[PDB]
């Protein structure tokens, strides 16, 4: 529990959690804090961090400042960023399509060395968007998420490989910075070492060495243990330092006039000058620990060097030659080995703050070029920063990261969990990582460095498998961006209560144990051969004295949407993937109901998401209405929480909050005061418990189809509200004004009855395809281009959102008015709608039956959903059988008869679990939960029904009656309660049909799509299949009269409407243009007959 | 083998050379053009040269490619061939710039030639 209003949910867990679940959007708020340099991050870092904690803005400016000019006379510098309060609030920003931003100011000092004068001012840098406490940004009204990025950390990476032709094992080296050019090295198929300075032509390697001022005596003292490197030396026609720099400036700047000083200033101002080449602290640290450099030193100097460009070659050469051990001349010993590329000690996380840092850097570089352009063209001592500085570029960068990027996404809100997994997401795509050239099959796989850092299961089903993932629940992010997960320190075999947040590099050095490993007396293990992992994920049994660390909990390597799947160790992996990715796309229901059998990770996933409302301060409740709630705290301060009522999510779902408190209620802090769209009493309730019978019926549940009662339609059980948004703009046309009025061109006044004075539709009315919503007249004199209901849509007009220019609030270029109309539709479960459970069990609804012909129990209870037997064992998802059993055990309580002791199947049960009433709620954590002994004998107890009759035996089975015949099915059937989820895949959204309509006028076929009102692709394979039948007229028909022939489809429409024989092309028609143009080429053609 | 023999720019990993005293300087040149890794297992004798080009000196053939790095070892004692035949062929060799370095043969317990 540990939460104030925590509804009790008993747990079968036999292990204790020495570490609570950390925050679940503390990976999107710590980074923004860092960026804006809030005081919270400042303290956190001063505790464990440097004594000069720099932020992300500070750092950018410090790298920018001081802006000196070629004459070193006048200098500009920035410092002290500072944010003033937000102009609006989240709700206001949404109501008005504004943006959630705070003004940013900066102190600019302007020094002149000539006169020693200063012109400091507090200049304005524009409005900066802000990260909402829910881990979001608000942009022109929409909630948006800046998803993290997985990218190759800066540093040196050596990769062996095989030559496509020679099939020869060769080697290589690649040096990649955070900013600047790359530097590669190779050992060729002919044993000649070489370099690829800025990915140009492969010239030799000693060329470089000389360009840095090395004499063959040095090249032969450092090297000389090798004989391919000497042989490379020997074949350098370009002997001579300056000849080498000429070679390089040539390969880089070919032909154009050279110079020696230019040569040194290029070889220097490309790698060694920390403005055109930078290894951020992470690249510097990687290089140092890799090559054996600068052990225990002040990393301050974050740029390349000349000693590392040599130790790199040396490493490479001792690699090609099979040497495992290296020692730089003055460094420390080191292992010689290849560097994996999917490993996460090499992959790193660009969080939102880093992305925005980089785009601000871009904007500032442009503002700096402008500063210079404008600094040496204006009288000195009369130029002030406010004259030198034009902020217009910077904002663009910002306005170009959110408005239009790939890592800034419309928020994925079908439900709280859909948005909470859109924030703990790890995307391997976007500018900076692999975009299209490396979407292969070895990066999309699982790697033993994923344990505790990235979920092996939760990854979408579409094209981004293995690219996009979700962060685990016990994982955080180093300041260097590498992901960390905690472990427990073993000292002699006795598990200490001390925590250590390790990363993959560190983890690979020890033996990490398992959470279920036993303990007897304050930690010591019971066994002798305990099971552990190792460097390469090499699971092994080992003596418990070899152990050095241990996992705090199971469910460490799983995500939120995957720690909410009970009995996961009983379900294979592809169907668990299905279960997660279907638990994301679950539509909220009118009245929500939380699972009887669930997991402990459903309270937090709702608190740590933000659709619930929690108390900021302890106190009592002063007023409770549907919309507002008013609290009087102990300090006397009065709080007021406004609730979202029937608001439209970005996916059509509803976003209605509702209170769960009574006036005069002494709430605590963090206590839930309102429930959201898919929560009940503060825990995720995405579906409903239904009475299920595992059995085949009269063919209507064939091949994963499934059956329903009409109860789920009478009582509005699986009903859901869906809202739609339609907008229309009254923008300029140069022929007058696009006017919104009611005096529409001549039409039935009966259409103009549900329209208010201004020609807009009246709230509360109901609509239907074609029905007018807002009458807009664009001038001609006047035409009719109004907003009418689309095809396959209807509903009640909830409300309206109008935006005029007579207020000058804001509207884009050339607009005078915008009207947004919202329409709502209550959608009931129906034949075709998709339905699922948390275990990958999914299907469509083939039959909806009256309750009088549903298999019922001896007590008269008709089951609510029938699922077939044949899909369970070949799909390997029996977790649903266990769920069914436990659902019964929980809807019907239990009392273990302990009169004669506790049965042997209960010797591991936590007391307080020896009894429970009806409609109870339990918890089976994914890898520490209900077993089969604890669940076999726990099915016998099963408190009787209101009549003393036990309707389910100790095997999980009842005796049903055919509601049609009347006789009992001759064998007992498996009955229970299952948690079932309704999904966004609905049939009112999929049924598409077409006879006629608009075409593409480019290819001159119908359009492709459903909103476009298009047709269906008849492809090549289909033409093959249509030929193998020997059907020629259908093919002709399809390829001429339907898509391309524009003079035939008309003849056809007319023929049909008139009822005459559908004609036939007397002579093929695609032939005539080609006939002309081959005749035009003086090639006689004669259509014969 | 078939990939290599069908190619001339092929860098091998090791090169064994038996009766090495019969290769012209250009032969060694081509070889070292084959093996840059300079891993060689040269075997030979200088007093038993047939070709006139030959080497007459390892330093003449190697110091151009491996100067001061090339190791050299010479077996000293003779056991396989009697010392009678050895004196016969040692006083045969005692002509045409002999500078005779006869390895000392031992264990000759049979009929003289």
Curated annotation (Swiss-Prot), chain A:
Pfam families linked: RNA_pol_Rpb2_1 (PF04563), RNA_pol_Rpb2_2 (PF04561), RNA_pol_Rpb2_3 (PF04565), RNA_pol_Rpb2_45 (PF10385), RNA_pol_Rpb2_6 (PF00562), RNA_pol_Rpb2_7 (PF04560)
Example of a GO MF term: DNA-directed RNA polymerase activity
Keyword Transferase carried by entry: yes
Keywords from the UniProt entry: Antibiotic resistance, DNA-directed RNA polymerase, Nucleotidyltransferase, Transcription, Transferase
GO cellular component: DNA-directed RNA polymerase complex
InterPro entries xref list: DNA-dir_RNA_pol_bsu_ext_1_sf, DNA-dir_RNA_pol_bsu_external_1, DNA-dir_RNA_pol_su2, DNA-dir_RNAP_su2_dom, DNA-dir_RNAP_su2_hyb_sf, RNA_pol_bsu_bac, RNA_pol_bsu_CS, RNA_pol_bsu_protrusion
Signal peptide: none
Consequence recorded when altering residue 425 to L/P: Rifampicin (Rif) resistant
Other remarks on this protein: Mutations in the RRDR sequence (residues 423-449) confer rifampicin (Rif) resistance. Rif blocks transcription initiation but not elongation.
Protein function: DNA-dependent RNA polymerase catalyzes the transcription of DNA into RNA using the four ribonucleoside triphosphates as substrates. This subunit often mutates to generate rifampicin (Rif) resistance. Interaction with RbpA partially restores Rif-inhibited transcription; once the subunit is Rif-resistant however RbpA no longer stimulates transcription.
Description of how the protein assembles with itself and partners: The RNAP catalytic core consists of 2 alpha, 1 beta, 1 beta' and 1 omega subunit. When a sigma factor is associated with the core the holoenzyme is formed, which can initiate transcription. Interacts with RbpA, which partially restores Rif-inhibited transcription.
Homology family: Belongs to the RNA polymerase beta chain family.
Listed name of the protein: DNA-directed RNA polymerase subunit beta
Species of the source: Mycolicibacterium smegmatis (strain ATCC 700084 / mc(2)155)
UniProt gene name: rpoB
């Amino acid at each position: 529990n540990s939460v104030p209003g925590a509804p009790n949910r008993v747990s079968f867990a036999k292990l204790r959690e020495p570490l609570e679940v950390p925050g679940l959007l503390d990976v999107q708020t710590d980074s923004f804090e860092w960026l804006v340099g809030s005081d919270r991050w400042r303290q956190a870092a001063i505790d464990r961090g440097e004594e000069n904690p720099v932020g992300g803005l500070e750092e950018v400016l410090a790298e920018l400042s001081p802006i000196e000019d070629f004459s070193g006379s006048m200098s500009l510098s920035f410092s002290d960023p500072r944010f003033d309060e937000v102009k609006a609030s989240v709700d206001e920003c949404k109501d008005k399509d504004m943006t959630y931003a705070a003004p940013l100011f900066v102190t600019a000092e302007f020094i002149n060395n000539n006169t020693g004068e200063i012109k400091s001012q507090t200049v304005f840098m524009g409005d900066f968007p802000m990260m909402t406490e829910k881990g979001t940004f608000i942009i022109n009204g929409t909630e948006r998420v800046v998803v993290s990025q997985l990218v190759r950390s800066p540093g040196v990476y050596f990769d062996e490989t095989i030559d496509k032709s020679t099939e020869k094992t060769l080697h290589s080296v690649k040096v990649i910075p955070g900013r600047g050019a790359w530097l590669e090295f190779d050992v060729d198929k002919r044993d000649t070492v070489g370099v690829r300075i800025d990915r140009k032509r492969r010239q030799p390697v000693t060329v470089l060495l000389k360009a840095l001022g090395w004499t063959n005596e040095q090249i032969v003292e450092r090297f000389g243990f090798s004989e391919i490197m000497m042989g490379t030396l020997e074949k350098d026609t370009t002997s001579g330092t300056d000849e080498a720099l000429l070679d390089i400036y040539r390969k880089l700047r070919p032909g154009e006039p050279p110079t020696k000083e230019s040569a040194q200033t290029l070889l220097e101002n490309l790698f060694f000058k920390e403005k055109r080449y930078d290894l951020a602290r992470v690249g510097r640290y990687k290089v140092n620990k890799k090559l054996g450099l600068n052990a225990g030193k002040p990393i301050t100097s974050s740029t390349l060097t000349e000693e590392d460009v040599v130790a790199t070659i040396e490493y490479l050469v001792r690699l090609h030659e099979g040497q495992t051990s290296m020692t730089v001349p003055g460094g420390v010993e080191v292992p010689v080995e290849v560097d994996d590329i999917d490993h996460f000690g090499n992959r790193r996380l660009r969080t939102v703050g880093e992305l925005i840092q980089n785009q601000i850097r871009v904007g500032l570089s442009r503002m700096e070029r402008v500063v210079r352009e404008r600094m040496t063209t204006q009288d000195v001592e009369a130029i002030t920063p406010q004259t030198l500085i034009n902020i217009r570029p910077v904002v663009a960068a910002i306005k170009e990261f959110f408005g239009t990027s790939q890592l800034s996404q419309f928020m994925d809100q079908n439900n709280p969990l859909s948005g909470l997994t859109h924030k703990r997401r790890l995307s391997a795509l976007g500018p900076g990582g692999l975009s299209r050239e490396r979407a292969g099959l070895e990066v999309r796989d699982v790697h033993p460095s994923h344990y505790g850092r990235m979920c092996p299961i939760e990854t979408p089903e579409g094209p981004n498998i293995g690219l996009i993932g979700s962060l685990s629940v016990y994982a955080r992010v180093n300041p260097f961006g590498f992901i960390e997960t905690p472990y427990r320190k073993v000292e002699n075999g006795v598990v200490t209560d001390q925590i250590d947040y390790l990363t993959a590099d560190e983890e690979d050095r020890h033996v990490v144990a398992q959470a279920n490993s036993p303990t007897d007396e304050n930690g010591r293990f019971t066994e002798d051969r305990v099971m552990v992992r190792k460097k390469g994920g090499e699971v092994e049994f080992v003596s418990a004295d070899q152990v050095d660390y241990m996992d705090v909990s199971p469910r460490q390597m799983v995500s939120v949407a995957t720690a909410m799947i009970p009995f996961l160790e009983h379900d294979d992996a592809n169907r668990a993937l299905m279960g997660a990715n279907m638990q994301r796309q679950a539509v909220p229901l009118v009245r929500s109901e939380a699972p009887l059998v669930g997991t402990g990770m459903e309270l937090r996933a709702a608190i740590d998401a933000g659709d619930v409302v929690v108390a900021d301060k302890t106190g009592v409740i002063e007023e409770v209405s549907a919309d507002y709630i008013t609290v009087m705290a102990d300090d006397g301060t009065r709080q007021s929480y406004r609730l979202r009522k029937f608001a439209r999510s970005n996916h059509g779902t509803c976003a209605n909050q509702r209170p769960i408190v009574d006036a005069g209620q002494r709430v605590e802090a963090g206590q839930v005061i309102a429930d959201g769209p898919c929560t009940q009493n503060g825990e995720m309730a995405l579906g409903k418990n239904l009475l299920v019978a595992i059995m085949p019926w009269e063919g209507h549940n064939y091949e994963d189809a499934i059956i329903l009662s009409n109860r789920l339609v009478e009582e509005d059980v699986l009903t859901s509200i869906h809202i739609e948004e339609h907008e229309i703009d009254a923008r300029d046309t140069k022929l007058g004004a696009e006017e919104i009025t009611r005096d529409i061109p001549n039409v039935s006044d009966e259409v103009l009855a549900d329209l208010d004075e201004r020609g807009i539709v009246r709230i509360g009315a109901e609509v239907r395809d074609g029905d007018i919503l807002v009458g807009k007249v664009t001038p001609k004199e006047v035409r009719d281009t109004s907003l009418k209901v689309p095809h396959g849509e209807s509903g009640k007009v909830i409300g309206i959102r109008v935006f005029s220019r007579e207020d000058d609030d804001e509207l884009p270029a050339g607009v005078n008015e915008l009207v947004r109309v919202y329409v709502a539709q209550k959608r009931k479960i129906s034949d075709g709608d998709k339905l699922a459970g948390r275990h990958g069990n999914k299907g469509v609804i083939g039959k909806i039956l009256p309750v009088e012909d549903m298999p019922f129990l001896p007590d008269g209870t008709p089951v609510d959903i029938i699922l077939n037997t044949h899909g369970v064992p070949r799909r390997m998802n029996i977790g649903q059988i266990l769920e069914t059993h436990l659902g019964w055990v929980a809807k019907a309580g239990w009392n273990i008869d302990v009169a004669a002791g506790v049965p042997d199947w209960a010797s591991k049960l936590p007391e307080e679990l020896y009894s429970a009433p009806a409609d109870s709620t339990v918890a089976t954590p994914v890898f520490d939960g209900a077993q089969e002994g604890e669940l076999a004998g726990l099915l016998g107890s099963t408190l009787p029904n209101r009549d003393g009759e036990v309707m389910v035996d100790a095997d999980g089975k009842s005796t049903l009656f055919d509601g049609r015949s009347g006789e009992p099915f001759p064998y007992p059937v498996t009955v229970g309660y299952m948690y079932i989820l309704k999904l966004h895949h609905l049939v009112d959204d999929k049924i598409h049909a077409r006879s006629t309509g608009p075409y593409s006028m480019i290819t001159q076929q119908p359009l492709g799509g459903k909103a476009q009102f298009g047709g269906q692709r008849f492809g090549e394979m289909e033409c093959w299949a249509m030929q193998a039948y020997g059907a020629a007229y259908t093919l002709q028909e399809l390829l001429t009269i339907k898509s391309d022939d524009t003079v035939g489809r008309v003849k056809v429409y007319e023929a049909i409407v008139k009822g005459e024989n559908i004609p036939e092309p007397g002579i093929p028609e695609s032939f005539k243009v080609l006939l002309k143009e081959l005749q035009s080429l003086c090639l006689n053609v004669e259509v014969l007959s | 083998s078939e990939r290599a023999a069908a190619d001339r720019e092929w860098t091998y990993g090791h090169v064994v050379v038996d009766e090495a005293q019969e290769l012209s300087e250009m032969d060694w040149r081509l070889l070292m053009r084959r093996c840059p890794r300079r891993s060689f297992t040269i075997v030979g004798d200088l007093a038993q040269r047939r070709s006139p080009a030959g080497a007459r000196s390892w330093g003449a053939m190697l110091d151009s490619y491996v100067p001061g790095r090339w190791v050299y070892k010479s077996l000293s004692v003779n056991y396989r061939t009697p010392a009678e035949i050895m004196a016969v062929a040692a006083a045969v060799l005692a002509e045409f710039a002999p500078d005779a370095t006869p390895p000392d043969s031992v264990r000759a317990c049979g009929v003289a030639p």
